[PDB]
């Protein structure tokens with residue numbers, strides 16, 4: 001049994017809810033929250049900007065030190081950093097950004113990072129300002145992630161379309 005409430009069960013391991021990822025993290029304090037990161041861990045907008053704002057910029061300060069030591073992530077890659085006030089850990093995952101011309105086949109590689117964590121609160125990778133089709137992102141998630149994933153969707157309209165169209 002876990003703390004996650006109000007989710008729609010899609011499969012054995014994937015759950016979905018219309019919720020503010022920030023507000024959901026603050027309520028649950030999950031072991032892992034996933035950030036929709038870029039390779040530079042520059043948390044300007046979208047999910048990343050919202051998560052970072054909720055940490056009062058501590059996520060960005062920590063991320064800048066990580067990049068200064070390790071250099072950029074790979075598209076499809078990830079790193080584990082602090083979850084600050086939101087979670088124990090933040091898994092920063094880089095999905096391909098279609099608005100930069102990145103290979104959408106890297107979306108599966110991105111979701112494979114979730115399999116290193118038994119339970120996660122996450123957004124749909126490469127959705128929103130990353131430019132991919134969220135219906136496609138949900139399909140790759142279900143067909144890739146084997147661990148227990150609780151997906152938070154920012155828009156009620158998109159949430160309802162994802163559920164109605166789910167095979």
Ligand SMILES: O=C(O)c1ccc2c(c1)OCO2
Nearest residue numbers: 046047050123127128129154
């Ligand atoms: O919370 C936000 O401001 C935000 C902004 C962009 C998003 C999102 C959340 O879900 C995925 O796309």
